[PDB]
DNA sequence: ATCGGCACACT
DNA sequence: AGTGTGCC
């Protein structure tokens, strides 16, 4: 079936922008982006409001270039600490949202601004409490039903379409059977409406949600009606939805694997995957992937929503690209120390707030003219949350790397990460 | 010089 | 353990 569970995916809209907009009222309802490291081309853009997007502004764009596209664009700068970007403000805002969501159901923190929710149980409970009662259209004020309306002047308006689709969906719904997968999705959507309302009221942040039977579909659904809307993707909408759906849009298919599927199989849409047998797919892409693709193109995925609200690892890194690369011993030690200081500050907060300690410290370095993203990876024991010792240990482990009071080759990157957390 | 940052599969 | 991928 693949209609066994109810899963939702919630994602904040232009999250960093919202954080800056809440803190500054002036940036509200204006085109704006968030940038870091202004010196170079005005800084790199990592977050763009929807007002700015209408002008074509995107992340990974230089602020100066963005200005050319959008003359009145307002910019917000990431806090800078110890010579590197500090994402503390956004991490704290993130916790706020996660905490509200946690109240409604067990969630999986997928990223800083999105979380997966398994509502299977909550939906069942709700059904019992409102048992025998129809679902009013009023309960789903921002819900879109994928694939509707269908068949037969309101439609010209976006809102008109949404209302008509929802009416058709609700009208079709049979209150009589609790078991119906579609009914459970509708109830789950009501819960997500309530959850989204709570988030907006308590944090002031707007967000979008996708409600479906699995995480991949939920994610896909979420992206359909951004921003400030939630989309319900039923099992039945999948054939029509997937039929013109590019392969790269499915989660985890945006990279090389997706490209292999397209290149090898000679298809461009998700639906086209249905013709191939499971065995064929497994032979081309492996047993695990083959199984996943065969099931996925039919709208079925079984990956569980992990009950995890905390990051497994905590790391900080800095790039020194091109000329800026560190060529001296003293430089490497100084930067290692800076990294260690931020790490210690985050670690202490983690120990006090989450009551756990990290057992392993990981050091990563890159050198000039290296094809590999990570030039080297090393780990050492992390006995105490002390910056001086941590930097010294990292240096001790990577001291052997230098080929030549000078360092050679110069280092493109420094990376420290704390891992292997244990209860304390 | 599109940065810093997470999780996972594979060996 | 260390490497490589994919995403936010
Ligand atoms: N440094 C950095 N931060 C990033 C990057 N990509 C995203 N972020 C940070 C900054 C982002 O604000 C935040 C959330 O990631 P999204 O959900 O993928 N995009 P948003 O919520 O902005 O918009 P919407 O969801 O409505 O399209 O993660 C990046 O490539 N680099
Ligand atoms: Mg977002
Ligand atoms: Mg996101």
The encoded tokens of residue A17 equal 């922008």
**Among A44, A45, A47, which residue has the most ligand 1 atoms within 8 Å of its CB, making it the best to mutate?**
A47
Query: Are A125 and A216 within one domain?
Result: yes
The encoded tokens of residue A189 equal 């959507």
Query: Are A120 and A170 within one domain?
Result: yes
- State the CATH number of the domain containing residue A359: 3.30.1490.100
Give whole-number Cα distances, A409 to A365, A367, A372, A403, in Å.
Answer: 11, 6, 15, 7
Q: How many CB atoms lie within 10 A of CB A179?
A: 9
Give the dihedral of Cα atoms A350, A355, A361, A364; nearest 10 deg: -30
Question: Which of A230, A183, A236, A203 is CA-nearest to residue A100?
Answer: A203
What is the spatial distance between Cα A410 and Cα A396, in angstroms, rounded to a whole number? 17
Is A11 within any annotated ligand binding site? yes
What is the spatial distance between Cα A283 and Cα A339, in angstroms, rounded to a whole number? 45
Query: Are A166 and A260 within one domain?
Result: no
Query: Are A238 and A254 within one domain?
Result: no
Give the dihedral of Cα atoms A121, A126, A132, A136; nearest 10 deg: -120
State the greatest distance between any 2 C-alpha atoms of chain A, in Å, as a whole number.
79
Is A125 within any annotated ligand binding site? no
- A328 Cα: distance to centroid of ligand 3 (angstroms): 38
Q: How many CB atoms lie within 10 A of CB A21?
A: 21
For ligand 1, whether the C-beta of A46 sits within 6 Å is yes
Method by which the model was determined = X-ray
Beta bridge partners of A419: A360
- Under DSSP, the state recorded for A78 is P
Domain count, chain A: 4
If you search the block for the tokens 């909550």, which residue do you land on?
A122
A9-CA/B4-C1' distance, Å: 24
Element spanning A293, H or E: helix A287-296
Query: Are A160 and A191 within one domain?
Result: yes
For ligand 1, whether the C-beta of A108 sits within 6 Å is no
| A215 and A305 Cβ atoms separated by less than 8 Å | yes
For ligand 1, whether the C-beta of A20 sits within 6 Å is no
Q: Show which of A24, A55, A83 is a domain's final residue.
A: A83
What is the spatial distance between Cα A196 and Cα A201, in angstroms, rounded to a whole number? 9
Helices (H), A355-402: 387-398
A48-CA/B11-C1' distance, Å: 40
| A59 and A75 Cβ atoms separated by less than 8 Å | no
For ligand 1, whether the C-beta of A227 sits within 6 Å is yes
Which atom of ligand 1 has the smallest separation from the CA of A226?
26
Is A103 within any annotated ligand binding site? no
- Ligand 1, atom 31, residue with closest C-alpha: A46
If you search the block for the tokens 């942040």, which residue do you land on?
A205
**SS3 label, residue A409:** strand
> Radius of gyration (Cα) for chain A, nearest Å?
25
| A73 and A48 Cβ atoms separated by less than 8 Å | no
- Ligand 1, atom 21, residue with closest C-alpha: A14
Q: How many CB atoms lie within 10 A of CB A325?
A: 18
Measured at the CA of A169, the angle between CA A168 and CA A173, to 5 degrees, comes to 115
What is the spatial distance between Cα A31 and Cα A72, in angstroms, rounded to a whole number? 7
Nucleotide lying nearest to A256, CA to C1' measure: C5
Residues in reach of strand B, judged by a CB distance below 7 angstroms, are A 36-37, 40, 44-46, 60-62, 84-85, 87, 111-112, 286, 288-289, 306, 308, 311-319, 321-324, 412-413
**SS3 label, residue A48:** strand
- Under DSSP, the state recorded for A308 is B
Question: Which of A374, A51, A84, A400 is CA-nearest to residue A227?
Answer: A51
What is the spatial distance between Cα A263 and Cα A359, in angstroms, rounded to a whole number? 44
Query: Are A56 and A99 within one domain?
Result: no
Q: Which domain holds residue A396?
A: 305-424
- Under DSSP, the state recorded for A311 is -
Dihedral sign computed on CA atoms, order A321, A322, A324, A330: positive
For A366, phi then psi, to 5°, come to -130, 150
Query: Are A377 and A402 within one domain?
Result: yes
Query: Are A44 and A93 within one domain?
Result: no
Query: Are A30 and A168 within one domain?
Result: no
Q: Show which of A34, A68, A83 is a domain's final residue.
A: A83
- State the CATH number of the domain containing residue A125: 3.30.70.270
Query: Are A138 and A275 within one domain?
Result: no
Query: Are A229 and A276 within one domain?
Result: no
For ligand 1, whether the C-beta of A205 sits within 6 Å is no
> Which bases of chain B are contacted by protein, using any atom under 7 A from a CB?
1-10
Q: How many CB atoms lie within 10 A of CB A127?
A: 17
Q: Show which of A83, A105, A121 is a domain's final residue.
A: A83
Per-residue b/e over A28-53, b at no fewer than 16 CB within 10 Å?
A: eeebbbbbbbeeebbbbbbbbbebbe
Work out the burial of residue A159: count CB atoms within 10 Å of its CB; fewer than 13 is exposed, 13-18 middle, 19 or more buried. Answer: exposed
A373-CA/C4-C1' distance, Å: 9
Query: Are A1 and A104 within one domain?
Result: yes
A46-CA/C8-C1' distance, Å: 10
């Amino acid at each position: 079936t693949g209609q066994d569970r109810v899963v939702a995916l919630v994602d904040m809209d232009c999250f960093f922008v919202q954080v800056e907009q809440r803190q500054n009222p002036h940036l509200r309802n204006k085109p704006c982006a968030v940038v870091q490291y202004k010196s170079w081309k005005g800084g790199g853009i990592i977050a763009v409001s929807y007002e700015a997007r209408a002008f074509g502004v995107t992340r990974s764009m230089w602020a100066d270039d963005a200005k050319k596209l959008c003359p009145d664009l307002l910019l917000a700068q990431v806090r800078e600490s110890r010579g590197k970007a500090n994402l503390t403000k956004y991490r704290e805002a993130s916790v706020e949202v996660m905490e509200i969501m946690s109240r409604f159901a067990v969630i999986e923190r997928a990223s800083i601004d999105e979380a997966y929710v398994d509502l299977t149980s909550a939906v069942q409970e709700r059904l019992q409490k409102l048992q025998g009662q129809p679902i009013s259209a009023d309960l789903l004020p921002s819900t879109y039903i994928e694939g509707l309306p269908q068949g037969p002047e309101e439609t010209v308006q976006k809102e008109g379409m949404r209302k008509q689709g929802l009416f058709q969906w609700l009208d079709s719904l049979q209150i009589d059977n609790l078991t119906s997968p579609d009914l459970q999705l509708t109830v789950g959507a009501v819960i997500v409406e309530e959850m989204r309302a709570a988030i907006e009221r308590e944090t002031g942040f707007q967000c979008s949600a996708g409600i479906s039977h699995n995480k991949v579909l939920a994610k896909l659904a979420c992206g359909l009606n951004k921003p400030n809307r939630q989309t319900l993707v039923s099992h039945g909408s999948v054939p029509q939805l997937f039929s013109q759906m590019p392969i790269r849009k499915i989660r985890s298919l945006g990279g090389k694997l997706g490209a292999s599927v397209i290149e090898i199989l000679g298809i461009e849409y998700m639906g086209e995957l249905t013709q191939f047998t499971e065995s064929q797919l497994q032979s081309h892409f492996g047993e695990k992937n083959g199984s996943w693709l065969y099931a996925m193109c039919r709208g079925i995925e079984h990956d569980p929503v992990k009950p995890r609200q905390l990051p497994k690892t905590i790391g900080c890194s800095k790039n020194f690209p091109g000329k800026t690369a560190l060529a001296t011993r003293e430089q490497v030690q100084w930067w290692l120390l800076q990294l260690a200081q931020e790490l210690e500050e985050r670690l202490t907060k983690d120990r006090n707030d989450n009551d756990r300690v990290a057992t392993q410290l990981v050091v990563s370095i890159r050198v000039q003219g290296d094809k590999r993203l990570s030039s080297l990876r090393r780990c050492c024991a992390l006995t105490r949350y002390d910056a001086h010792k941590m930097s010294h240990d990292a240096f001790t482990v990577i001291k052997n790397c230098n080929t030549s009071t000078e360092w050679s080759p110069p280092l493109t990157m420094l990376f420290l990460c704390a891992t292997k957390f244990s209860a304390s």
